[PDB]
Every structure is written in C-alpha cells, then in structure tokens.
Amino acid sequence: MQNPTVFFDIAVDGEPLGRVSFELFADKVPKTAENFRALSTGEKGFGYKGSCFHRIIPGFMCQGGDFTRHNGTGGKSIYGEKFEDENFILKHTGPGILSMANAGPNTNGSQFFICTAKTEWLDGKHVVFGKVKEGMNIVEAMERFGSRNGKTSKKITIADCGQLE
C-alpha cells in the first residue's frame, strides 16, 4: 500500500544541518523494511535519540545502525541478534541506496548504510533495499566529514528520529 519512510536530523558541531528521507520497499522486502524502520520507531524501546553515525567512509558510504554502543558493536534487531536476508531483488543500482551491512551471511543484526556510489563489489552478498527520496545533498555533506579511518572530523548526531509515513 505505502512505502514507510524514516529520517535523521543530522547536526554538525552542535548545530543542525538538514534531514534525509528514505523510501523502503516493504512489499519487496518486508523483513528488512520492517526491521529497518522498527529501530527508528523504537517499538522494542531502543529509542536511539542523538545517536551518531557509527562509521563513515569518504567516496564509499556512510555506515551506521549501532545505537547501543555507537562503536559498530552492541547493535541489535527487534527479532534478535540477526535475521535472514529476504532476497536480492533490489541491488546497488546507484547512489543513495540503503543497504543492511553485516559481518557475514544471514548476520544482518542491526546495521545499515547509505551508499554514495554504486558498489557492484558489495552486491550479490549484502541484502539491499532503500533509496534517498530527498536530502541526498545532506548525505553527501556527512560523507565530506567522513575519513578513511572511519572517524568523523565533525560531530554528527540525530537531533530527532521517528517514523515518516
């Protein structure tokens, strides 16, 4: 019927920058789509407010999803430690696509990233479903503050998180 959208209020150096919306294919991938927005909704109670992007890399993508420790660890899904990939119907067609990062097969757990460039080398193993409806210009901004080491020159936090439609 509808494609749930979620967004993050990104603030740099204690001040707001903008918001980014995302289009999730619930019909195509009900498993990842519900889990993906579920974390934002905080139905289970994660309620990650102000969480900063766990890891950002320039010329590749912005990695995040870790809200409990913000160190790439402690992240967890509503179902449990990890969940299976629904399918690879939607691939890394282009930039702005949101994908569920994992440490291996069927180990998605809690972790997703916003790609900035087409990653064919990531496709075929990493389940992916999502795109930026609007606010990419903001995503790129976050990428600018990213580094090879994964650390950010500035401080990116989520001023507010909720379910958009």
UniProtKB/Swiss-Prot annotation:
Modified residues (Phosphothreonine): T93
Gene Ontology terms: biological process: activation of protein kinase B activity; apoptotic process; cell adhesion molecule production; cellular response to oxidative stress; endothelial cell activation; leukocyte chemotaxis; lipid droplet organization; negative regulation of oxidative stress-induced intrinsic apoptotic signaling pathway
Residue span(s) of domain PPIase cyclophilin-type: 7-163
Compartments, record wording: Cytoplasm; Secreted; Nucleus
Effect listed in the UniProt record for changing R55A: Loss of peptidyl-prolyl cis-trans isomerase activity. No loss of its interaction with BSG/CD147 or its ability to induce leukocyte chemotaxis. No effect on its interaction with MAP3K5/ASK1
Residue(s) carrying N-acetylvaline: Q2
Position(s), cross-link Glycyl lysine isopeptide (Lys-Gly) (interchain with G-Cter in ubiquitin): K28
Glycosylation (residues): N108
Entry comment on modification after translation: Acetylation at Lys-125 markedly inhibits catalysis of cis to trans isomerization and stabilizes cis rather than trans forms of the HIV-1 capsid. PPIA acetylation also antagonizes the immunosuppressive effects of cyclosporine by inhibiting the sequential steps of cyclosporine binding and calcineurin inhibition. Acetylation at Lys-125 favors its interaction with TARDBP.
Regulation affecting activity: Binds cyclosporin A (CsA). CsA mediates some of its effects via an inhibitory action on PPIase.
Recorded catalytic activity of this chain's protein: [protein]-peptidylproline (omega=180) = [protein]-peptidylproline (omega=0)
Location (main, coarse): cytoplasm
GO molecular function: cyclosporin A binding; heparan sulfate binding; integrin binding; peptidyl-prolyl cis-trans isomerase activity; RNA binding; unfolded protein binding; virion binding
GO CC, alphabetical: cytoplasm; cytosol; extracellular exosome; extracellular region; extracellular space; ficolin-1-rich granule lumen; focal adhesion; membrane
Modified residues (N6-acetyllysine): K28, K44, K76, K82, K125, K131, K133
Recorded superkingdom: Eukaryota
Impact after mutating W121E: Loss of peptidyl-prolyl cis-trans isomerase activity
Positions bearing the Glycyl lysine isopeptide (Lys-Gly) (interchain with G-Cter in SUMO2) cross-link: K28, K82
Residues with PTM Phosphoserine: S77
Keywords: Acetylation, Apoptosis, Cytoplasm, Glycoprotein, Host-virus interaction, Isomerase, Isopeptide bond, Nucleus, Phosphoprotein, Rotamase, Secreted, Ubl conjugation
InterPro entries, per the entry: Cyclophilin-like_dom_sf (IPR029000), Cyclophilin-type_PPIase (IPR024936), Cyclophilin-type_PPIase_CS (IPR020892), Cyclophilin-type_PPIase_dom (IPR002130)
Effect the entry attributes to changing K125Q: Acetylation-mimetic mutant; no effect on its interaction with TARDBP
Family of this protein: Belongs to the cyclophilin-type PPIase family. PPIase A subfamily.
Chain's role: Catalyzes the cis-trans isomerization of proline imidic peptide bonds in oligopeptides. Exerts a strong chemotactic effect on leukocytes partly through activation of one of its membrane receptors BSG/CD147, initiating a signaling cascade that culminates in MAPK/ERK activation. Activates endothelial cells (ECs) in a pro-inflammatory manner by stimulating activation of NF-kappa-B and ERK, JNK and p38 MAP-kinases and by inducing expression of adhesion molecules including SELE and VCAM1. (Microbial infection) May act as a mediator between human SARS coronavirus nucleoprotein and BSG/CD147 in the process of invasion of host cells by the virus.
Subunit structure of this chain's protein: Interacts with protein phosphatase PPP3CA/calcineurin A. Interacts with PRPF19 isoform 2 (via N-terminus). Interacts with isoform 2 of BSG/CD147. Interacts with FOXO1; the interaction promotes FOXO1 dephosphorylation, nuclear accumulation and transcriptional activity. Interacts with integrin ITGA2B:ITGB3; the interaction is ROS and peptidyl-prolyl cis-trans isomerase (PPIase) activity-dependent and is increased in the presence of thrombin. Interacts with MAP3K5.
Name of this chain's protein: Peptidyl-prolyl cis-trans isomerase A
Taxonomic classification: Eukaryota, Metazoa, Chordata, Craniata, Vertebrata
